[PDB]
Amino acid sequence: LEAQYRERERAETEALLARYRERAEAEAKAVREKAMARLDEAVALVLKEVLP
């Protein structure tokens, strides 16, 4: 009875992780693109306060 409960759970606790890995990766890309088109703006902010 244990034998058929374990393999049920195992086969969902891989798939669930797998799906989360596709969101993870894509939301990694989604924080990149917001910053990279407001990137020049940051660099102006760094320049202005290193010259004192």
The 3-class secondary structure across 23-36, one letter per residue, is HHHHHHHHHHHHHH
Residue 6 Cβ, how far from other proteins at the closest point, in Å? Answer: 19
In this complex, which beta carbon is closest to other proteins, that of residue 1 or of residue 31?
Answer: 31
Q: Is 19 in the site for other proteins (CB under 8 A)?
A: no
CA distance 12 to 23: 17
In this complex, which beta carbon is closest to other proteins, that of residue 3 or of residue 18?
Answer: 18
Q: Is 17 in the site for other proteins (CB under 8 A)?
A: yes
